[PDB]
Amino acid sequence: ETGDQRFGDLVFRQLAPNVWQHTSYLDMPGFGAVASNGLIVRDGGRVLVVDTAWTDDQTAQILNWIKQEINLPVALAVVTHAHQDKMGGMDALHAAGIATYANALSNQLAPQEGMVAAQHSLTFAANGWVEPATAPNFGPLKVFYPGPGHTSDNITVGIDGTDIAFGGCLIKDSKAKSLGNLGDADTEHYAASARAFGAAFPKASMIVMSHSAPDSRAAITHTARMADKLR
Amino acid sequence: ETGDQRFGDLVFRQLAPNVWQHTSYLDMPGFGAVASNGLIVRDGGRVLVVDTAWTDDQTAQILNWIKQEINLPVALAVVTHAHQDKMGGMDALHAAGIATYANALSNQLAPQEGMVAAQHSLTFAANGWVEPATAPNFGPLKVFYPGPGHTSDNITVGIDGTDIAFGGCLIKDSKAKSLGNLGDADTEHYAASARAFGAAFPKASMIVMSHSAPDSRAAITHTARMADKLR
Ligand SMILES: O=C(O)[C@H](CCCn1c(-c2ccccc2)n[nH]c1=S)N(Cc1ccccn1)Cc1ccccn1
Ligand SMILES: [Ca+2]
Ligand SMILES: [Ca+2]
Ligand SMILES: [Ca+2]
Ligand SMILES: [Ca+2]
Ligand SMILES: [Zn+2]
Ligand SMILES: [Zn+2]
Ligand SMILES: [Zn+2]
Ligand SMILES: [Zn+2]
């Protein structure tokens, strides 16, 4: 995939001058190697991370890659729900003294989901927007809770100053034939939540997501239409 | 129901010097009348309400019983999830000038659930406790989000200075043979959420719930044991 950089067993792709996608892989029984994507954002003299890799050792390699390619300190990480692809590498962040943030519900669920909770909890208004007091110095990361979907706690992140919005595991690409792992999903509200993400980030033309390469806005509508079939 | 009062279609039962249960009924298509309970709390010179009745008219009857029998202003109501038994009467509360509070997630889901949102949104720390700035002047009402269960947004309320805690629709009585309406339930996390409610209010000995008469703490552990079988 031209423009991908391999760094150990992780892949990094630059999406914009100050934004990269990090990709890590799990061997899955019945699936083979499964990719999970998150984001790295350079914001002045600091770096902000969205989502861990699947494991601590892989997440440590994200930090090493950041040191080598960007060489600015990581100020914080946001993790977008309590599943292993997103929070499996929390100990690597905490070992490195990085402040971590998740939906309060993600932190509340983390023990039952076998995840380490983030240090800090985000809360949200009734319209889905993060309460700013709970997202200190998030810079360009604009966090939106679109409602229950892939999980009840899934959050999304727009990257202000860019055309990029991150749908996490709520959004699948427009070529998807399924909505992936629905084990913890809210099948009643998933469609409205997918639609709410699209309405929250109207400027976004590149939709990044956990288990698909970046796609256009059609990923959002296609996802919402697949979810409509669950109701 | 010796000692119970009737006002219109509503039934009232005093649980403590300053606490009453309100009960309203919806005649459902193919079960018959279904009771739903909430609370009325006298807090010095004001009244606090937990949950509406099923309908606006029934909710107005609650408020008129309060004016007749207690004759103190209702300062606020907190509603415990976005279903009709708990939020069906929001328009009546608002017509009466009562400030209304609900979990932010209840307010967000309310349109899809066919409910009117409360005015103000409660948010919660990762340990379940309400963030106090979102619950100003709640007096003895201690609001705790135990985690997803009967619905993702269900909240619970303890009344300081009494032996009473209100589980809403998360908790079923100790002789129940099922967990009732699981249509919007989180079957994976329900049992832990029920236990969390018990842990939040460890000294409560009277557990009030939406669809049975008050029970002892046995209701909490029975509900959790039933929920264990969902996993
Ligand atoms: O929870 C149930 O399914 C309904 C009550 C469900 C109440 N409800 C609703 C709702 C229901 C109808 C219309 C609008 C809203 N939204 N959220 C909740 S909550 N319950 C029967 C039951 C109980 C136990 C086992 C099986 N069914 C009420 C009940 C319980 C015990 C005795 C008599 N009635
Ligand atoms: Ca670990
Ligand atoms: Ca799970
Ligand atoms: Ca109404
Ligand atoms: Ca519903
Ligand atoms: Zn997930
Ligand atoms: Zn995922
Ligand atoms: Zn309900
Ligand atoms: Zn109920």
PDB file of N, CA, C and O in Angstrom, chain A residues 114-174:
ATOM      1  N   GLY A 114     -12.387  -6.555  30.687  1.00  0.00           N
ATOM      2  CA  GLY A 114     -10.981  -6.964  30.771  1.00  0.00           C
ATOM      3  C   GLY A 114     -10.012  -5.877  30.298  1.00  0.00           C
ATOM      4  O   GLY A 114      -8.879  -6.224  29.887  1.00  0.00           O
ATOM      5  N   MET A 115     -10.443  -4.610  30.372  1.00  0.00           N
ATOM      6  CA  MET A 115      -9.606  -3.476  30.005  1.00  0.00           C
ATOM      7  C   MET A 115      -9.161  -2.710  31.260  1.00  0.00           C
ATOM      8  O   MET A 115      -9.858  -2.638  32.245  1.00  0.00           O
ATOM      9  N   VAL A 116      -7.975  -2.116  31.220  1.00  0.00           N
ATOM     10  CA  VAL A 116      -7.564  -1.089  32.164  1.00  0.00           C
ATOM     11  C   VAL A 116      -8.288   0.224  31.865  1.00  0.00           C
ATOM     12  O   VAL A 116      -8.256   0.710  30.733  1.00  0.00           O
ATOM     13  N   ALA A 117      -8.928   0.833  32.876  1.00  0.00           N
ATOM     14  CA  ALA A 117      -9.604   2.107  32.618  1.00  0.00           C
ATOM     15  C   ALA A 117      -8.610   3.230  32.321  1.00  0.00           C
ATOM     16  O   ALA A 117      -7.465   3.216  32.790  1.00  0.00           O
ATOM     17  N   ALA A 118      -9.055   4.195  31.509  1.00  0.00           N
ATOM     18  CA  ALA A 118      -8.305   5.406  31.353  1.00  0.00           C
ATOM     19  C   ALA A 118      -8.287   6.179  32.665  1.00  0.00           C
ATOM     20  O   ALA A 118      -9.123   5.944  33.575  1.00  0.00           O
ATOM     21  N   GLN A 119      -7.324   7.100  32.766  1.00  0.00           N
ATOM     22  CA  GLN A 119      -7.192   7.907  33.970  1.00  0.00           C
ATOM     23  C   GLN A 119      -8.307   8.898  34.169  1.00  0.00           C
ATOM     24  O   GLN A 119      -8.506   9.321  35.303  1.00  0.00           O
ATOM     25  N   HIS A 120      -8.902   9.378  33.084  1.00  0.00           N
ATOM     26  CA  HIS A 120      -9.858  10.489  33.152  1.00  0.00           C
ATOM     27  C   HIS A 120     -11.081  10.116  32.324  1.00  0.00           C
ATOM     28  O   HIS A 120     -11.003   9.356  31.312  1.00  0.00           O
ATOM     29  N   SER A 121     -12.214  10.693  32.741  1.00  0.00           N
ATOM     30  CA  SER A 121     -13.489  10.372  32.103  1.00  0.00           C
ATOM     31  C   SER A 121     -14.080  11.598  31.415  1.00  0.00           C
ATOM     32  O   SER A 121     -14.153  12.687  31.951  1.00  0.00           O
ATOM     33  N   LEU A 122     -14.548  11.373  30.179  1.00  0.00           N
ATOM     34  CA  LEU A 122     -15.236  12.403  29.411  1.00  0.00           C
ATOM     35  C   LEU A 122     -16.725  12.249  29.703  1.00  0.00           C
ATOM     36  O   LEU A 122     -17.254  11.128  29.850  1.00  0.00           O
ATOM     37  N   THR A 123     -17.405  13.399  29.770  1.00  0.00           N
ATOM     38  CA  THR A 123     -18.872  13.362  29.817  1.00  0.00           C
ATOM     39  C   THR A 123     -19.426  14.190  28.671  1.00  0.00           C
ATOM     40  O   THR A 123     -18.699  14.945  27.998  1.00  0.00           O
ATOM     41  N   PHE A 124     -20.729  13.997  28.397  1.00  0.00           N
ATOM     42  CA  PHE A 124     -21.302  14.532  27.165  1.00  0.00           C
ATOM     43  C   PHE A 124     -22.623  15.211  27.440  1.00  0.00           C
ATOM     44  O   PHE A 124     -23.333  14.804  28.352  1.00  0.00           O
ATOM     45  N   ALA A 125     -22.915  16.224  26.644  1.00  0.00           N
ATOM     46  CA  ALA A 125     -24.209  16.892  26.700  1.00  0.00           C
ATOM     47  C   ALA A 125     -25.268  16.022  26.037  1.00  0.00           C
ATOM     48  O   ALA A 125     -24.973  15.063  25.353  1.00  0.00           O
ATOM     49  N   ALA A 126     -26.544  16.427  26.177  1.00  0.00           N
ATOM     50  CA  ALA A 126     -27.620  15.641  25.559  1.00  0.00           C
ATOM     51  C   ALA A 126     -27.554  15.650  24.034  1.00  0.00           C
ATOM     52  O   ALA A 126     -28.128  14.757  23.399  1.00  0.00           O
ATOM     53  N   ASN A 127     -26.835  16.623  23.453  1.00  0.00           N
ATOM     54  CA  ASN A 127     -26.703  16.649  22.012  1.00  0.00           C
ATOM     55  C   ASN A 127     -25.475  15.866  21.529  1.00  0.00           C
ATOM     56  O   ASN A 127     -25.245  15.822  20.311  1.00  0.00           O
ATOM     57  N   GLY A 128     -24.783  15.186  22.465  1.00  0.00           N
ATOM     58  CA  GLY A 128     -23.672  14.327  22.078  1.00  0.00           C
ATOM     59  C   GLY A 128     -22.300  14.983  22.189  1.00  0.00           C
ATOM     60  O   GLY A 128     -21.297  14.263  22.227  1.00  0.00           O
ATOM     61  N   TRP A 129     -22.228  16.319  22.214  1.00  0.00           N
ATOM     62  CA  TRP A 129     -20.912  16.956  22.252  1.00  0.00           C
ATOM     63  C   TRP A 129     -20.275  16.761  23.615  1.00  0.00           C
ATOM     64  O   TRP A 129     -20.919  16.885  24.639  1.00  0.00           O
ATOM     65  N   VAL A 130     -18.970  16.515  23.619  1.00  0.00           N
ATOM     66  CA  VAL A 130     -18.246  16.424  24.891  1.00  0.00           C
ATOM     67  C   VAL A 130     -18.406  17.711  25.697  1.00  0.00           C
ATOM     68  O   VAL A 130     -18.385  18.855  25.183  1.00  0.00           O
ATOM     69  N   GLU A 131     -18.473  17.511  27.021  1.00  0.00           N
ATOM     70  CA  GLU A 131     -18.458  18.672  27.901  1.00  0.00           C
ATOM     71  C   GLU A 131     -17.024  19.171  27.970  1.00  0.00           C
ATOM     72  O   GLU A 131     -16.115  18.444  28.366  1.00  0.00           O
ATOM     73  N   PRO A 132     -16.747  20.412  27.518  1.00  0.00           N
ATOM     74  CA  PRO A 132     -15.351  20.857  27.377  1.00  0.00           C
ATOM     75  C   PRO A 132     -14.493  20.793  28.625  1.00  0.00           C
ATOM     76  O   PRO A 132     -13.297  20.518  28.536  1.00  0.00           O
ATOM     77  N   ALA A 133     -15.103  20.974  29.789  1.00  0.00           N
ATOM     78  CA  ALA A 133     -14.338  20.905  31.037  1.00  0.00           C
ATOM     79  C   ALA A 133     -13.706  19.524  31.216  1.00  0.00           C
ATOM     80  O   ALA A 133     -12.714  19.394  31.947  1.00  0.00           O
ATOM     81  N   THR A 134     -14.321  18.486  30.597  1.00  0.00           N
ATOM     82  CA  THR A 134     -13.840  17.115  30.777  1.00  0.00           C
ATOM     83  C   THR A 134     -12.832  16.714  29.705  1.00  0.00           C
ATOM     84  O   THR A 134     -12.274  15.608  29.826  1.00  0.00           O
ATOM     85  N   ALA A 135     -12.535  17.633  28.762  1.00  0.00           N
ATOM     86  CA  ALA A 135     -11.619  17.337  27.655  1.00  0.00           C
ATOM     87  C   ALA A 135     -10.538  18.408  27.634  1.00  0.00           C
ATOM     88  O   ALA A 135     -10.397  19.186  26.661  1.00  0.00           O
ATOM     89  N   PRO A 136      -9.724  18.469  28.706  1.00  0.00           N
ATOM     90  CA  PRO A 136      -8.739  19.550  28.822  1.00  0.00           C
ATOM     91  C   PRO A 136      -7.654  19.494  27.746  1.00  0.00           C
ATOM     92  O   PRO A 136      -6.998  18.458  27.575  1.00  0.00           O
ATOM     93  N   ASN A 137      -7.449  20.657  27.093  1.00  0.00           N
ATOM     94  CA  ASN A 137      -6.357  20.816  26.120  1.00  0.00           C
ATOM     95  C   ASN A 137      -6.411  19.746  25.017  1.00  0.00           C
ATOM     96  O   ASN A 137      -5.382  19.244  24.584  1.00  0.00           O
ATOM     97  N   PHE A 138      -7.640  19.404  24.581  1.00  0.00           N
ATOM     98  CA  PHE A 138      -7.814  18.476  23.449  1.00  0.00           C
ATOM     99  C   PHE A 138      -7.417  19.097  22.106  1.00  0.00           C
ATOM    100  O   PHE A 138      -7.313  18.341  21.121  1.00  0.00           O
ATOM    101  N   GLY A 139      -7.164  20.415  22.069  1.00  0.00           N
ATOM    102  CA  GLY A 139      -6.620  20.972  20.814  1.00  0.00           C
ATOM    103  C   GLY A 139      -7.612  20.677  19.691  1.00  0.00           C
ATOM    104  O   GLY A 139      -8.805  20.902  19.815  1.00  0.00           O
ATOM    105  N   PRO A 140      -7.168  20.053  18.600  1.00  0.00           N
ATOM    106  CA  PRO A 140      -8.045  19.863  17.460  1.00  0.00           C
ATOM    107  C   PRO A 140      -8.977  18.671  17.622  1.00  0.00           C
ATOM    108  O   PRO A 140      -9.780  18.435  16.758  1.00  0.00           O
ATOM    109  N   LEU A 141      -8.804  17.852  18.675  1.00  0.00           N
ATOM    110  CA  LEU A 141      -9.672  16.681  18.813  1.00  0.00           C
ATOM    111  C   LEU A 141     -11.029  17.107  19.315  1.00  0.00           C
ATOM    112  O   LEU A 141     -11.138  17.679  20.401  1.00  0.00           O
ATOM    113  N   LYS A 142     -12.061  16.887  18.492  1.00  0.00           N
ATOM    114  CA  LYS A 142     -13.412  17.298  18.823  1.00  0.00           C
ATOM    115  C   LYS A 142     -14.243  16.035  19.038  1.00  0.00           C
ATOM    116  O   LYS A 142     -14.575  15.302  18.108  1.00  0.00           O
ATOM    117  N   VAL A 143     -14.514  15.739  20.315  1.00  0.00           N
ATOM    118  CA  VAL A 143     -15.102  14.445  20.668  1.00  0.00           C
ATOM    119  C   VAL A 143     -16.619  14.498  20.718  1.00  0.00           C
ATOM    120  O   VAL A 143     -17.181  15.447  21.308  1.00  0.00           O
ATOM    121  N   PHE A 144     -17.244  13.520  20.063  1.00  0.00           N
ATOM    122  CA  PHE A 144     -18.704  13.474  19.936  1.00  0.00           C
ATOM    123  C   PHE A 144     -19.169  12.069  20.285  1.00  0.00           C
ATOM    124  O   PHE A 144     -18.648  11.069  19.795  1.00  0.00           O
ATOM    125  N   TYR A 145     -20.124  11.991  21.203  1.00  0.00           N
ATOM    126  CA  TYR A 145     -20.807  10.734  21.504  1.00  0.00           C
ATOM    127  C   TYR A 145     -22.075  10.655  20.689  1.00  0.00           C
ATOM    128  O   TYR A 145     -23.016  11.419  20.931  1.00  0.00           O
ATOM    129  N   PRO A 146     -22.159   9.741  19.724  1.00  0.00           N
ATOM    130  CA  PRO A 146     -23.273   9.806  18.779  1.00  0.00           C
ATOM    131  C   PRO A 146     -24.475   9.011  19.259  1.00  0.00           C
ATOM    132  O   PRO A 146     -25.530   9.107  18.620  1.00  0.00           O
ATOM    133  N   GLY A 147     -24.321   8.339  20.404  1.00  0.00           N
ATOM    134  CA  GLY A 147     -25.370   7.451  20.880  1.00  0.00           C
ATOM    135  C   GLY A 147     -24.920   6.009  20.752  1.00  0.00           C
ATOM    136  O   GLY A 147     -23.918   5.697  20.125  1.00  0.00           O
ATOM    137  N   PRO A 148     -25.663   5.081  21.363  1.00  0.00           N
ATOM    138  CA  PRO A 148     -25.284   3.670  21.379  1.00  0.00           C
ATOM    139  C   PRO A 148     -25.305   3.065  19.981  1.00  0.00           C
ATOM    140  O   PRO A 148     -26.200   3.350  19.175  1.00  0.00           O
ATOM    141  N   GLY A 149     -24.299   2.238  19.676  1.00  0.00           N
ATOM    142  CA  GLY A 149     -24.283   1.622  18.353  1.00  0.00           C
ATOM    143  C   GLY A 149     -23.484   0.334  18.400  1.00  0.00           C
ATOM    144  O   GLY A 149     -23.985  -0.707  18.824  1.00  0.00           O
ATOM    145  N   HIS A 150     -22.250   0.406  17.921  1.00  0.00           N
ATOM    146  CA  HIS A 150     -21.351  -0.716  18.038  1.00  0.00           C
ATOM    147  C   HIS A 150     -21.227  -1.149  19.495  1.00  0.00           C
ATOM    148  O   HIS A 150     -21.212  -2.343  19.762  1.00  0.00           O
ATOM    149  N   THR A 151     -21.143  -0.153  20.392  1.00  0.00           N
ATOM    150  CA  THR A 151     -21.250  -0.403  21.830  1.00  0.00           C
ATOM    151  C   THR A 151     -22.055   0.754  22.407  1.00  0.00           C
ATOM    152  O   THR A 151     -22.292   1.765  21.729  1.00  0.00           O
ATOM    153  N   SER A 152     -22.482   0.627  23.680  1.00  0.00           N
ATOM    154  CA  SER A 152     -23.200   1.742  24.264  1.00  0.00           C
ATOM    155  C   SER A 152     -22.275   2.924  24.551  1.00  0.00           C
ATOM    156  O   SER A 152     -22.759   4.041  24.651  1.00  0.00           O
ATOM    157  N   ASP A 153     -20.947   2.692  24.642  1.00  0.00           N
ATOM    158  CA  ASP A 153     -20.017   3.732  25.095  1.00  0.00           C
ATOM    159  C   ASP A 153     -19.199   4.307  23.922  1.00  0.00           C
ATOM    160  O   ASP A 153     -18.461   5.227  24.184  1.00  0.00           O
ATOM    161  N   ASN A 154     -19.420   3.835  22.665  1.00  0.00           N
ATOM    162  CA  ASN A 154     -18.572   4.257  21.551  1.00  0.00           C
ATOM    163  C   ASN A 154     -18.581   5.772  21.374  1.00  0.00           C
ATOM    164  O   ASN A 154     -19.643   6.403  21.349  1.00  0.00           O
ATOM    165  N   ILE A 155     -17.381   6.357  21.199  1.00  0.00           N
ATOM    166  CA  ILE A 155     -17.277   7.780  20.907  1.00  0.00           C
ATOM    167  C   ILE A 155     -16.551   7.959  19.575  1.00  0.00           C
ATOM    168  O   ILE A 155     -15.940   7.004  19.052  1.00  0.00           O
ATOM    169  N   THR A 156     -16.683   9.169  19.048  1.00  0.00           N
ATOM    170  CA  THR A 156     -16.122   9.527  17.753  1.00  0.00           C
ATOM    171  C   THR A 156     -15.307  10.803  17.906  1.00  0.00           C
ATOM    172  O   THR A 156     -15.485  11.537  18.871  1.00  0.00           O
ATOM    173  N   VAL A 157     -14.383  11.075  16.953  1.00  0.00           N
ATOM    174  CA  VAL A 157     -13.476  12.212  17.124  1.00  0.00           C
ATOM    175  C   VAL A 157     -13.287  12.908  15.782  1.00  0.00           C
ATOM    176  O   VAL A 157     -12.765  12.260  14.855  1.00  0.00           O
ATOM    177  N   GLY A 158     -13.662  14.168  15.727  1.00  0.00           N
ATOM    178  CA  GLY A 158     -13.329  14.939  14.529  1.00  0.00           C
ATOM    179  C   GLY A 158     -11.956  15.548  14.706  1.00  0.00           C
ATOM    180  O   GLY A 158     -11.556  15.897  15.814  1.00  0.00           O
ATOM    181  N   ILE A 159     -11.219  15.715  13.582  1.00  0.00           N
ATOM    182  CA  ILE A 159      -9.902  16.346  13.703  1.00  0.00           C
ATOM    183  C   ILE A 159      -9.998  17.754  13.142  1.00  0.00           C
ATOM    184  O   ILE A 159     -10.003  17.974  11.926  1.00  0.00           O
ATOM    185  N   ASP A 160     -10.198  18.720  14.044  1.00  0.00           N
ATOM    186  CA  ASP A 160     -10.413  20.085  13.598  1.00  0.00           C
ATOM    187  C   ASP A 160      -9.213  20.577  12.785  1.00  0.00           C
ATOM    188  O   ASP A 160      -8.095  20.139  13.016  1.00  0.00           O
ATOM    189  N   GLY A 161      -9.491  21.453  11.793  1.00  0.00           N
ATOM    190  CA  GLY A 161      -8.444  21.966  10.920  1.00  0.00           C
ATOM    191  C   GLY A 161      -8.114  21.024   9.770  1.00  0.00           C
ATOM    192  O   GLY A 161      -7.157  21.257   9.025  1.00  0.00           O
ATOM    193  N   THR A 162      -8.857  19.907   9.633  1.00  0.00           N
ATOM    194  CA  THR A 162      -8.637  18.910   8.602  1.00  0.00           C
ATOM    195  C   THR A 162     -10.006  18.452   8.104  1.00  0.00           C
ATOM    196  O   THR A 162     -11.026  18.845   8.691  1.00  0.00           O
ATOM    197  N   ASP A 163      -9.945  17.635   7.058  1.00  0.00           N
ATOM    198  CA  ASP A 163     -11.146  17.072   6.468  1.00  0.00           C
ATOM    199  C   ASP A 163     -11.494  15.726   7.096  1.00  0.00           C
ATOM    200  O   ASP A 163     -12.285  14.996   6.513  1.00  0.00           O
ATOM    201  N   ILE A 164     -10.878  15.386   8.248  1.00  0.00           N
ATOM    202  CA  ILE A 164     -10.869  14.013   8.763  1.00  0.00           C
ATOM    203  C   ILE A 164     -11.763  13.885   9.991  1.00  0.00           C
ATOM    204  O   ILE A 164     -11.758  14.772  10.852  1.00  0.00           O
ATOM    205  N   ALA A 165     -12.629  12.845   9.957  1.00  0.00           N
ATOM    206  CA  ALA A 165     -13.368  12.496  11.178  1.00  0.00           C
ATOM    207  C   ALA A 165     -13.197  10.996  11.421  1.00  0.00           C
ATOM    208  O   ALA A 165     -13.141  10.164  10.493  1.00  0.00           O
ATOM    209  N   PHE A 166     -13.048  10.654  12.730  1.00  0.00           N
ATOM    210  CA  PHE A 166     -12.820   9.266  13.104  1.00  0.00           C
ATOM    211  C   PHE A 166     -14.079   8.631  13.688  1.00  0.00           C
ATOM    212  O   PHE A 166     -14.574   9.068  14.730  1.00  0.00           O
ATOM    213  N   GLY A 167     -14.585   7.614  13.007  1.00  0.00           N
ATOM    214  CA  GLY A 167     -15.814   6.939  13.412  1.00  0.00           C
ATOM    215  C   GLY A 167     -15.567   5.727  14.288  1.00  0.00           C
ATOM    216  O   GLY A 167     -16.488   5.165  14.855  1.00  0.00           O
ATOM    217  N   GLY A 168     -14.292   5.393  14.507  1.00  0.00           N
ATOM    218  CA  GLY A 168     -13.994   4.216  15.313  1.00  0.00           C
ATOM    219  C   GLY A 168     -14.673   2.973  14.764  1.00  0.00           C
ATOM    220  O   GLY A 168     -14.715   2.743  13.556  1.00  0.00           O
ATOM    221  N   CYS A 169     -15.213   2.172  15.680  1.00  0.00           N
ATOM    222  CA  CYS A 169     -15.796   0.916  15.223  1.00  0.00           C
ATOM    223  C   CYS A 169     -17.285   1.101  14.947  1.00  0.00           C
ATOM    224  O   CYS A 169     -17.900   0.160  14.441  1.00  0.00           O
ATOM    225  N   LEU A 170     -17.821   2.329  15.128  1.00  0.00           N
ATOM    226  CA  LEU A 170     -19.227   2.543  14.758  1.00  0.00           C
ATOM    227  C   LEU A 170     -19.453   2.483  13.238  1.00  0.00           C
ATOM    228  O   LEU A 170     -20.457   1.981  12.765  1.00  0.00           O
ATOM    229  N   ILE A 171     -18.503   3.038  12.485  1.00  0.00           N
ATOM    230  CA  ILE A 171     -18.656   3.158  11.019  1.00  0.00           C
ATOM    231  C   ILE A 171     -17.839   2.084  10.325  1.00  0.00           C
ATOM    232  O   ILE A 171     -16.692   1.855  10.697  1.00  0.00           O
ATOM    233  N   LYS A 172     -18.440   1.461   9.304  1.00  0.00           N
ATOM    234  CA  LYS A 172     -17.702   0.500   8.474  1.00  0.00           C
ATOM    235  C   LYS A 172     -17.665   1.080   7.050  1.00  0.00           C
ATOM    236  O   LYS A 172     -18.428   1.991   6.730  1.00  0.00           O
ATOM    237  N   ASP A 173     -16.766   0.553   6.221  1.00  0.00           N
ATOM    238  CA  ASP A 173     -16.652   1.212   4.928  1.00  0.00           C
ATOM    239  C   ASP A 173     -17.824   0.861   4.013  1.00  0.00           C
ATOM    240  O   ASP A 173     -18.644  -0.006   4.291  1.00  0.00           O
ATOM    241  N   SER A 174     -17.897   1.627   2.932  1.00  0.00           N
ATOM    242  CA  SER A 174     -19.059   1.489   2.048  1.00  0.00           C
ATOM    243  C   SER A 174     -19.071   0.169   1.277  1.00  0.00           C
ATOM    244  O   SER A 174     -20.094  -0.136   0.668  1.00  0.00           O
TER     245      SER A 174
END
